[PDB]
Symmetry: C5
Subunit: 347 residues, 5 copies
Amino acid sequence: TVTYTARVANARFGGFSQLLLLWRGSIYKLLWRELLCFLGFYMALSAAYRFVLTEGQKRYFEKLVIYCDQYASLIPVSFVLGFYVTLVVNRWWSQYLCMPLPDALMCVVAGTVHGRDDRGRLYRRTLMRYAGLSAVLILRSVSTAVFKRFPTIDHVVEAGFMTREERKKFENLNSSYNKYWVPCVWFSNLAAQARREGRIRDNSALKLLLEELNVFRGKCGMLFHYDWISVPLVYTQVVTIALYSYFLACLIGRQFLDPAQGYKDHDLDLCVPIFTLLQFFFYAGWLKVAEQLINPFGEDDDDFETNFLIDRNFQVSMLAVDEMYDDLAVLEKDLYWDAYTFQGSTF
Amino acid sequence: TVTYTARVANARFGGFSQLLLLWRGSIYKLLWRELLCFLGFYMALSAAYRFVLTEGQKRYFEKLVIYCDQYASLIPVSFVLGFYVTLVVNRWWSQYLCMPLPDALMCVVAGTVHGRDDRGRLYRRTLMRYAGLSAVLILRSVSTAVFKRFPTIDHVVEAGFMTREERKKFENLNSSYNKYWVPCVWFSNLAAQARREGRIRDNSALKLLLEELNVFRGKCGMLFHYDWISVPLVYTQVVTIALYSYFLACLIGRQFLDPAQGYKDHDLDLCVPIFTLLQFFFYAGWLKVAEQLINPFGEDDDDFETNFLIDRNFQVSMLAVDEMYDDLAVLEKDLYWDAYTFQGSTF
Amino acid sequence: TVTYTARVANARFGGFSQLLLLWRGSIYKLLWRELLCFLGFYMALSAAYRFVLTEGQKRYFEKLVIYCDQYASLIPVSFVLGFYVTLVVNRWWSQYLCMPLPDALMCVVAGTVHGRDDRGRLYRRTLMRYAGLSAVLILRSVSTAVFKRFPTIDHVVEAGFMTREERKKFENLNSSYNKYWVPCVWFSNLAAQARREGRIRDNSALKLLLEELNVFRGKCGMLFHYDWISVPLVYTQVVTIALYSYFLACLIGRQFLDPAQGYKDHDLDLCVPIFTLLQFFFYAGWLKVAEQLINPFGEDDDDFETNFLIDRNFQVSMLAVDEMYDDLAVLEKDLYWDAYTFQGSTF
Amino acid sequence: TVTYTARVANARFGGFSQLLLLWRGSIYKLLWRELLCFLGFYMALSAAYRFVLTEGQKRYFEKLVIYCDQYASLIPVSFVLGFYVTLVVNRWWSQYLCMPLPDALMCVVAGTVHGRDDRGRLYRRTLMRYAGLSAVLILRSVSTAVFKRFPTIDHVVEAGFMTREERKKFENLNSSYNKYWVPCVWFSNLAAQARREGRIRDNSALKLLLEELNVFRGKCGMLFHYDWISVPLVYTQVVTIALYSYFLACLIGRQFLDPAQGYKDHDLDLCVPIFTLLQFFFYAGWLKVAEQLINPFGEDDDDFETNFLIDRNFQVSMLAVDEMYDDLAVLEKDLYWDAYTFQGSTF
Amino acid sequence: TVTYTARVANARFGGFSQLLLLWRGSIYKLLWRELLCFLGFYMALSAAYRFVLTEGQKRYFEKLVIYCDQYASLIPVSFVLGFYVTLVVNRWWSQYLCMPLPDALMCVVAGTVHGRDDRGRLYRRTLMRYAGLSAVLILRSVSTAVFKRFPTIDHVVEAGFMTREERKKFENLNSSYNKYWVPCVWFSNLAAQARREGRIRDNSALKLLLEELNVFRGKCGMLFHYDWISVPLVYTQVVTIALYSYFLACLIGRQFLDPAQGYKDHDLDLCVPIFTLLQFFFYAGWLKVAEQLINPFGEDDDDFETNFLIDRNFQVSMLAVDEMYDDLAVLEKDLYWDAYTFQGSTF
Ligand SMILES: Nc1ccc(C(=O)O)cc1
Ligand SMILES: Nc1ccc(C(=O)O)cc1
Ligand SMILES: Nc1ccc(C(=O)O)cc1
Ligand SMILES: Nc1ccc(C(=O)O)cc1
Ligand SMILES: Nc1ccc(C(=O)O)cc1
Ligand SMILES: [Ca+2]
Ligand SMILES: [Ca+2]
Ligand SMILES: [Ca+2]
Ligand SMILES: [Ca+2]
Ligand SMILES: [Ca+2]
Ligand SMILES: [Cl-]
C-alpha cells in the first residue's frame, strides 16, 4: 500500500501535480517497459517505412495505414475496458473489506472472558490466537506474500500461531479441503468450555462471542471465495485482446506518412507519435492498474500489506486481551464534571 | 470455475498475455463456432459479389453496401449490451453469494449442541445433514449439474443426505411446491427438541442456532428466487436481436468493394474483414459471456462447482461437528507468553 | 413471470437464438402494435411525398427531411433513456425482494410455539395466518391482480385469511390509512399471550419471533412505500417526450428521398426504412420494458405471480406449522456414521 | 408526492402517453417559465439579426453563429449532468428511506409494554409519542413544510407532541445543538423505568425495545446528516454553469441564418428552433428534476408528504399501542383447519 | 461543510442561479488560480504567434495547431475522469458515514448504566468519554484539522478527553501501532465492571452495550482503513496526467490562427478562447472537486467539520448521560388521550 492521504488533505494550487514525482506505486513503474516496447515496435515500423520499402511498397503501406486508422475505432476498447475496470475496482475494495480483524473479537474477549490468573490469560490469549491463526491460514492460502512468509505449516508453528499439539490435531484431520475453518471450530469449542467453567459469566456473553467469531470466520470465508471465484477469465481475455488489437492497429495507422503525397490529415511529420503514446499510456495504464488490483494480495507496491496486518493484529490482540485486561484507571472525575489551538435548513 | 488468481498476483511485464493461451473457460472455446459461421456467411457474400453478380447487380450491391455501412450504426448495440451485461454480472455475483454454506451453522452446532456420547453425535450430525439436505434440494432444483447427479429423491437417499424414513415423511407431505424448506423445519424442530432435552444448555444458544438456520434458509430461498425470477425475457430478446441485426448489417456493409469504382473509403481490398471480425469477436464475446453467466449453475467451464461445493460442505460439516467436537489441544502457553522469511496521515 | 433459466443453463451454440421464438412475455407481444403504428405513419408520409406533393412541395419536403435528419440527434434519447431504465430495473428488483415471505417466521413458529394439542395448533396457525393476512392486505393495496382476486375485505374473509370476528375488529378500528399493519399488531399481541401462557418457553424465543415479525412487517411496509413513492413523474414524462419527439423527427428525416435529386446519402431508395424500424424497435422496446417493470404487480406476462405466491405462502406456512410440527423422523445414524452419476492460489 | 403507480400497472398500448396530460408534479409545471425565457432571448436575438444588424454586422454575426455552433459541444453538459443527476437521485431515495416510522417500535411496544390499566396506557402512549416527537423535531429541523406547520416549539406543544412539563425540560437543557435526540433519551429512560416497574416482563424485551429505538434514532440522525451534508456546492455550481453556458452558446449558434448566403447546413429557415427547444427542454428538465429532488422536504409537488406522514404515524402508533393492545379476537379455527375471481429450472 | 439545503428546498424559477454568487466552498475559489495560469500560458503562446514568429514559423505553428486540435481528442479525459470522480464521491460519502457518533451509545448508557449517585454519574460519563476519546484519537490520526487542534496527547489530556492516569496507561502500553482502539478496550472492561457491580442490571443490557461499542469501534476502524488505503496512486497519477496533457494539447490547438490563411474552421479570431476556457473550467473543476473530496478531513471549505462534530458529540453525550439520566417528566395524559398552520394504487 502506497499512502498519500496527508499530501491531499487540502485542495492546494499544485494539488495533484506533486504526486506525479512519486515512483513507488506509480504508473511509470508499472508501465515504462510496456511503453518502451510499444515505442520500439512503432519506430521499427517507421524506420522500415522510411528506409526500406520501395515507392510502390510505400504507397501500399500508406493505403494500409489510412484504413487501419479509420476502422481501428471499431474495437470497443473503452466500453469493455470500463466495464472490466469497474468490476475489478469493486472487487478490490470488497476484498480489502473482507480481511479479518480481531478488534471486535478482542474487545468482546477482554470484556467477557474473565480471570486475572494464568488460566484466564490462557483462555483469552488462546481465543485471540485461534482467530489470528484462522486469518493466517486463509491469508497464506490466498496471499503470495504471506505464503512466502509461511511456506509450510511448520513456519506457522514456529511463528507462535500454532502449537505442536495443535499442529498434530490439524494434520490428523482427514480433510482434502482448506482447513482455515479449523481454528474457528477450536474457538467455538474453547468458548463453550470457558462458559461451562464459569470464565464467561452469562449465556448472552457466549452468544456475543459466537456472533463475533462468526463475523470473523465469514470474513475469512469471503477471502477464500474471492480467491477461488476469479473475475471470469473470458472478460480478462477479451479485455487483453481488445487492448492488444487496438494498439496493433494504432501501431500501423498512427504512422506518419510522407507529407509530399498530399494525404488528408498527413501534413505534419512529428516522427514520434505523442497522442498515440499518450493514448497508449492512458489505456494500457488503465489495464495495468486492473492487473495490479485484480489480485490485491500479491507483492505489487500498491497491494495490501498482509504481513504488516498480520503482525499488527497479533500484537494488538495480545495486548488488548492480556495486558489491558482489567487494567482500568481508577474512576476519576473529568474536566467538565461540574460544568482549539448548525441546527437545520429551516432554521 | 476456472481459477487464475495466482497467475495474476503481481502485475508482471507480460501480465495478462500469458492468460491468452488458456483454452478451458476461454473466449475462444465459447465463440469459435460463432466466429466461424460469421466468417462463412461473409465469404459466401464476398464470393457471390466477386464471381456471380453482373456489373449492374454489382453496382446495386455496392450502393446497398455503402448504405448498410452508414446506418448500421443506428442499432444501439453498445447501450443495450452494456446495460444487459452489467445486470447479468451483478446477478451472477449475487447468486454466487446466495449459495448456502454450513460454516456458520457448523461452528454454532459444535459450540452449542453438546454430548460426547452417541446421542450428541446424532444430534450434531443430523442438524448438519438437514442443512446439507436443504442445500442439495435447492441446488438440484436450480442446478442442472446437481440434478444430473441427483435425478431423483432416491439418489438423494442413496447419497446419505436423506434417510428412508425421512424420505417417507418428505413424500407424504401434501404440497405442490418445492419442498427444499422441509429440512429447515426439521432443523428447527430438532433444535427445539435438543434444547428441551438439555443438549443445548441455554435459550440464547437456541436463538443463535435459529438465527444461523434462518440465514442458511434465506440463502436457499434466494437461490430459488434467482432461479425463478429470470432476467426479463424482453431484455434477452432485445439484446439478441440487436446483436444479430447489427452483425447482419455488418455482413453487408463490411464488404470490400472493387476499388476501381472509386468509392470513398474503399481503396484497399483486404479480402478478410479484420476489424469487423474483431468487432464481432468483442461484441459477440460480451454477449456469450452474458449467456454463460446468466445461469451460473449449468455445466459451462466457468460455471459454479456446485457438486464440489456440496461434497466439500458435507465433509467439512461432518468433520467439524463430529470429529472436532470437544477435541481441543490442552491449553498451552504460546510463544509470546512472556514477551519473516503506519499510524495516520497527520502523523 | 416468464421463466427461461433452464434453457440458458449452458452457453450453447444457438444459445439465445432459441429464445427469439417465444411469444409470452416477449418484446414482440409488447411492441408489435407500436411498431405497426410507427410504420403506418411513415408509409403515410412516404405515400404523400411520392404521390401527392408537387415538385416545389417535394423540394421543400426534402429540405425539411435533411434538416430533421441532422438535428434529430440533439434529442438526448440514449442518456435519459439509460438513466430511466437503470432506475426502473433497480426498483424492480428491490420491489421483488420486498415481497414478504413466511419461511423465516414459519421456521421460528415451528421451533418456538409449542403444543401438540388443539391450542398449540391454533396458536401456530393463527400466527402464520396473521402474517399471511398482512401480506394479502398490502398486496391487494399495491397489486391490481390481487385486488381483482380480493376486491373487498369480504373476499378476504371468505378466503380464510380473516375471520368474521377479526373482520369486525378490523372494520371497527378508527383509521383513515391502510390497515395492513393491523395483523402485525395482532401477531405481536398473540405472541405475547403465547409467551405468557407458556406456549413459548423462553424470552429469547419471543424476541426472535418479534424480530422475524418486524422483518416481515418491514417488507410489507417497503411494498407500501414503493407503491406510494412512484418514480418521479417528471422523469416518466421527460423520457416519454424524448422518445416521441425523436421518433417523430425520425418519421420525417428517415424518409427516402428521390435519388434523382442527387442529395448526398440518398442514392438507394429501399422504400421500407429498416434501420429506423430497428432503431425504433430497440429504443421503444427499452421504454416498453421500463413500462412493464415500472409496476411489477400488474397483470403483464412478466409481472410477479402475486396470487401464486399468496397461495404458495399460505399452503407452505400451514404445512410447516401444523403438519410438520414435532413430526421428526427418529434420530437414525446416517450413511457416513463410521466413515456422482481447490485450496488456494498460492498452493 | 404525485402517485401514478396504478395507471402504469400494465404496459398498455398508450402506456406512458396518458401521463403526458398531467399538470401537477409535471415537467411543464417546473419548466414552462424557463422555456419561455429561453425562447424569448432567442427570438430577441433573431429579431435583432433580422431587422437591426446591417449587412456587415449580419455577416459577422453569421460567422460568430457558425463558430458557437461547432464548439458549444466542448461544454461537457451530458457528462457532468449525468453524474450530478445520478448522485441526486441516489440521495433522494436514501433520504426517503431515512424517514423514521414507528411501525416496528409500535409493534414492539404493543407486544412488550403491558397493562390494561391507565398506567400501561400512559407508558405505551408516552413511548410512541416520544418517538413521534423525535421525528417531528428532526423534520421541522430539515423540512420547510413541517417548520411552517410547527414554526415554534409552542406549536409542537399545542399539537400534543410535547407537554408543558416536557417543554420546560426541553428548554432548560443547556445545549447549543439540535435537540431532536432528547426524546430518544427520554424513551430510553422510560423504557428502563417500565422494565424496573415490571411493565416490561423480561430483559430481552427491553433489549428489543432499545434496539428498535436505536434504529428509529439512527433514521432521525441520518435525516439530520443528509440535511447538513448537502451535495457539494462545487458540483451544483459546475452543473448550473455548464447548463447556462451551453444554452447561451446554443442561443447564438442555433440561430437560423439567411439561406441566401449559401452557408452549409443553413438552407431551411424554420424561424422557431424546435430541436434546440427540445434539447433545452430535456437538459433543463433533467437539471430542474435534480433541483426538485435535491431537497425532497420542501414544498414541491413531488416532494415528500412529511406532514401527512407525521399525522399518519401519530394516529397509527396511538391506535396500535392504545386501542389494539390486548384486543385480539378469540382464537378461532380457520377455514382450512381440517383441509380466485413452479419448482425449478432442472425440473 | 458549506450548507445550502434550505435555499434549494423548492425548485423555484431562479433555483440554482442564486447559488452561483456564493464564494465560500465554491468552484471559483478552488479554480481561479488554475484558470488564470491556463489563460496566461495561452495568451503567452498567442502573443508569441502574433508578434514573434516569422511567416514560415507561423505556417509551421499553424500546421502544428491543426494537428494538436484533431488528435488531442485521443486523450480519454472523460472516461478516466468519470471513473475517478465516481470512485472519489462514493468514498467521500462512505467516509462521512464512517465518522463515529455516540448517540446510540449514549441512549444505551442512559437506559442501562444506573445510579443517581456520584458513582453512576462517573460510570456513565467515563463510558461516554472513552467513546469520545477513541473518536478523537482516530480523528487526529486521520484529520489534519483535528491534529492541529490536538498536536500531542498532552493536548488531549488538557481537553478533558484523557486523564493523567489514563495518559500514563496509554503511553506505557508497548505498541508500535495506532492506539485508538485502547479506549474501546477500556470501555469493554468498564462495562464488564459495571455489570459485575450491579450498575448494569442484566446480561442483555451488557450485550447491547458491547454491540453498540463494537459498532462505534468499527466506525473508527473504518475511518482508519479509509485513511490508510488511499485511492490507488496509479489512478490519481493517470487522471492528473490526462488532464494536464489534454489541456496542453488544447493550449496549442485552441489557438486562433490568422483567418487570412483560409484554414477551414478558422474564420473568426475571438482572441480569448471561451469554449476552451469553459471546457477547462468544467474538466479542471471536476478534477479539483475530486481533489477536495479525496481527503474530506483536511481544511477545505467543503471538508467535514470534524472539530465541530467532536465538540457537539462530547457535549451531547455528557448531557444525555449525566443531566438527562432518570430525569423524565411525570407521566401525563397527552392531548388525544380520550380522542396545520393514500391507501394504494388498486384503490
Ligand atoms: N496520422 C497520425 C495521426 C496521429 C498520430 C499521433 O498523434 O500519434 C500520428 C500519426
Ligand atoms: N468497407 C469496409 C470497411 C471496414 C471493413 C473491416 O475492417 O472489416 C471492411 C470493409
Ligand atoms: N435517408 C434515410 C436514412 C436512413 C434510413 C433508414 O435506415 O431507415 C432511411 C432513409
Ligand atoms: N443552424 C441551426 C441548427 C439547428 C437549429 C435547431 O434545430 O434549433 C436551428 C438552427
Ligand atoms: N481553432 C479554435 C477552436 C476553438 C477555440 C475555442 O473555442 O476556444 C479556439 C480556437
Ligand atoms: Ca496484483
Ligand atoms: Ca450458464
Ligand atoms: Ca407493469
Ligand atoms: Ca426540492
Ligand atoms: Ca481535501
Ligand atoms: Cl440477543
